[PDB]
Design a protein around this motif. Structure first.
Motif, PDB file in Angstrom:
ATOM      1  N   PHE A   1       0.694  -1.137   0.141  1.00 30.45           N
ATOM      2  CA  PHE A   1       0.047   0.066  -0.154  1.00 30.45           C
ATOM      3  C   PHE A   1       0.913   1.261  -0.146  1.00 30.45           C
ATOM      4  CE2 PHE A   1      -3.915  -2.041   0.978  1.00 30.45           C
ATOM      5  CZ  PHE A   1      -3.655  -3.149   1.534  1.00 30.45           C
ATOM      6  N   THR A   2       0.288   2.472  -0.244  1.00 35.28           N
ATOM      7  CA  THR A   2       0.939   3.667  -0.420  1.00 35.28           C
ATOM      8  C   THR A   2       0.033   4.481   0.657  1.00 35.28           C
ATOM      9  OG1 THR A   2       1.729   3.284  -2.708  1.00 35.28           O
ATOM     10  CG2 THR A   2       1.758   5.607  -1.624  1.00 35.28           C
ATOM     11  N   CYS A   3       0.732   5.042   1.584  1.00 35.44           N
ATOM     12  CA  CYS A   3       0.412   5.968   2.470  1.00 35.44           C
ATOM     13  C   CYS A   3       0.800   7.471   2.029  1.00 35.44           C
ATOM     14  CB  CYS A   3       0.638   5.692   3.796  1.00 35.44           C
ATOM     15  SG  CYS A   3       0.120   7.212   5.048  1.00 35.44           S
ATOM     16  N   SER A   4      -0.249   8.363   1.802  1.00 32.95           N
ATOM     17  CA  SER A   4       0.346   9.635   1.289  1.00 32.95           C
ATOM     18  C   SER A   4       0.014  10.611   2.236  1.00 32.95           C
ATOM     19  CB  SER A   4      -0.137  10.241  -0.076  1.00 32.95           C
ATOM     20  OG  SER A   4      -0.092   9.078  -1.051  1.00 32.95           O
ATOM     21  N   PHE A   5       1.036  11.455   2.424  1.00 33.47           N
ATOM     22  CA  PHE A   5       0.801  12.512   3.865  1.00 33.47           C
ATOM     23  C   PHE A   5       1.623  13.493   3.695  1.00 33.47           C
ATOM     24  CE2 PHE A   5       1.623  14.132   8.308  1.00 33.47           C
ATOM     25  CZ  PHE A   5       0.208  14.667   8.374  1.00 33.47           C
ATOM     26  N   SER A   6       1.318  14.900   3.510  1.00 32.49           N
ATOM     27  CA  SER A   6       2.233  15.853   3.872  1.00 32.49           C
ATOM     28  C   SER A   6       1.795  16.961   4.785  1.00 32.49           C
ATOM     29  CB  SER A   6       2.495  16.580   2.284  1.00 32.49           C
ATOM     30  OG  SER A   6       1.197  17.078   1.854  1.00 32.49           O
ATOM     31  N   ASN A   7       2.903  17.212   5.668  1.00 34.23           N
ATOM     32  CA  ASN A   7       2.751  18.044   6.766  1.00 34.23           C
ATOM     33  C   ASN A   7       4.062  19.143   7.033  1.00 34.23           C
ATOM     34  OD1 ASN A   7       2.131  19.414   9.340  1.00 34.23           O
ATOM     35  ND2 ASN A   7       2.711  17.594  10.538  1.00 34.23           N
ATOM     36  N   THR A   8       3.764  20.516   6.886  1.00 38.72           N
ATOM     37  CA  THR A   8       4.823  21.510   7.148  1.00 38.72           C
ATOM     38  C   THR A   8       5.010  21.714   8.405  1.00 38.72           C
ATOM     39  N   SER A   9       5.982  21.137   9.351  1.00 40.38           N
ATOM     40  CA  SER A   9       6.259  21.089  10.632  1.00 40.38           C
ATOM     41  C   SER A   9       5.326  20.161  11.609  1.00 40.38           C
ATOM     42  CB  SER A   9       6.594  22.859  11.026  1.00 40.38           C
TER      43      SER A   9
ATOM     44  N   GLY B   1       8.837  12.537  -0.484  1.00 40.16           N
ATOM     45  CA  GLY B   1       8.955  12.916   1.035  1.00 40.16           C
ATOM     46  C   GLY B   1       7.548  12.697   1.390  1.00 40.16           C
ATOM     47  N   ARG B   2       6.466  12.849   0.363  1.00 40.53           N
ATOM     48  CA  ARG B   2       5.155  12.698   0.839  1.00 40.53           C
ATOM     49  C   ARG B   2       4.370  11.157   0.821  1.00 40.53           C
ATOM     50  NH1 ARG B   2       5.796  16.505  -3.215  1.00 40.53           N
ATOM     51  NH2 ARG B   2       4.478  15.043  -4.591  1.00 40.53           N
ATOM     52  N   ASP B   3       5.224  10.426  -0.136  1.00 42.52           N
ATOM     53  CA  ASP B   3       4.456   8.933  -0.342  1.00 42.52           C
ATOM     54  C   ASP B   3       5.378   8.070   0.810  1.00 42.52           C
ATOM     55  OD1 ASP B   3       2.587  10.127  -1.781  1.00 42.52           O
ATOM     56  OD2 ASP B   3       3.853   9.853  -3.585  1.00 42.52           O
ATOM     57  N   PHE B   4       5.009   6.986   1.130  1.00 42.31           N
ATOM     58  CA  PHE B   4       5.531   5.870   1.822  1.00 42.31           C
ATOM     59  C   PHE B   4       4.903   4.628   1.536  1.00 42.31           C
ATOM     60  CE2 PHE B   4       6.889   8.884   5.349  1.00 42.31           C
ATOM     61  CZ  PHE B   4       6.320   9.803   4.906  1.00 42.31           C
ATOM     62  N   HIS B   5       5.746   3.509   1.377  1.00 47.72           N
ATOM     63  CA  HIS B   5       5.458   2.368   0.986  1.00 47.72           C
ATOM     64  C   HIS B   5       4.970   1.507   2.019  1.00 47.72           C
ATOM     65  CE1 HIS B   5       6.455   1.898  -3.685  1.00 47.72           C
ATOM     66  NE2 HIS B   5       5.384   2.693  -3.381  1.00 47.72           N
ATOM     67  N   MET B   6       4.009   0.811   2.295  1.00 46.94           N
ATOM     68  CA  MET B   6       3.728  -0.073   3.466  1.00 46.94           C
ATOM     69  C   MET B   6       3.609  -1.410   2.581  1.00 46.94           C
ATOM     70  SD  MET B   6       2.997   3.037   4.591  1.00 46.94           S
ATOM     71  CE  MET B   6       2.535   3.892   6.259  1.00 46.94           C
ATOM     72  N   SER B   7       4.541  -2.156   3.067  1.00 46.56           N
ATOM     73  CA  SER B   7       4.597  -3.558   2.095  1.00 46.56           C
ATOM     74  C   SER B   7       4.748  -4.662   3.152  1.00 46.56           C
ATOM     75  CB  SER B   7       5.993  -3.609   1.445  1.00 46.56           C
ATOM     76  OG  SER B   7       6.049  -2.702   0.389  1.00 46.56           O
ATOM     77  N   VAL B   8       3.717  -5.819   2.778  1.00 38.67           N
ATOM     78  CA  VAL B   8       3.809  -6.974   3.281  1.00 38.67           C
ATOM     79  C   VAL B   8       4.667  -7.758   2.700  1.00 38.67           C
ATOM     80  CG1 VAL B   8       2.545  -9.073   4.206  1.00 38.67           C
ATOM     81  CG2 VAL B   8       1.645  -6.658   4.133  1.00 38.67           C
ATOM     82  N   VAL B   9       5.553  -8.474   3.348  1.00 36.28           N
ATOM     83  CA  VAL B   9       6.668  -9.366   2.524  1.00 36.28           C
ATOM     84  C   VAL B   9       5.957 -10.889   2.364  1.00 36.28           C
ATOM     85  CG1 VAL B   9       8.887 -10.396   2.331  1.00 36.28           C
ATOM     86  CG2 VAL B   9       8.370  -8.093   2.791  1.00 36.28           C
TER      87      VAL B   9
END
Length: 108
Positions: free
Chosen positions: A20-28, A62-70
């Motif tokens: 999955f991809t979690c997208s989140f952006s937060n300035t500070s 910097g805004r996207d993260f991969h959450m992977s089950v192996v």
């Protein structure tokens, strides 16, 4: 704005990886947690950023993260979300909508 978590429904075959991809952006700053929410017995925090078969990797934008089950297993099926925790004035968690993982049996 809360993280979004996609795809909303990911189906893979047991043995395969599931991302999955979690997208989140937060300035500070923030902690970004990946939770399993169902089944009710199996709820658990899986993995985190920054920090077995569950991996969280920040992509270069910097805004996207991969959450992977192996190597997904049948009992990995369920629903999951990503939640961001902020401390800066002053502390709160913002969660994505859930996404569902279906892990298909390898029927011989």
């Amino acid at each position: 704005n809360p993280p979004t978590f996609s795809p909303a429904l990911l189906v893979v075959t047991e043995g395969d990886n599931a991302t999955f991809t979690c997208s989140f952006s937060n300035t500070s700053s923030f902690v970004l947690n990946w939770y399993r929410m169902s089944p009710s017995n199996q709820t658990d925090k899986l993995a985190a950023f920054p920090e077995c078969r569950f991996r969280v990797t920040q992509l270069p934008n910097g805004r996207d993260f991969h959450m992977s089950v192996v190597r997904a297993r049948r009992n990995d099926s369920g629903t999951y979300l990503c939640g961001a925790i902020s401390l800066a004035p002053k502390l709160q968690i913002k969660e994505s909508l859930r996404a569902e993982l279906r892990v298909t049996e390898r029927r011989a």
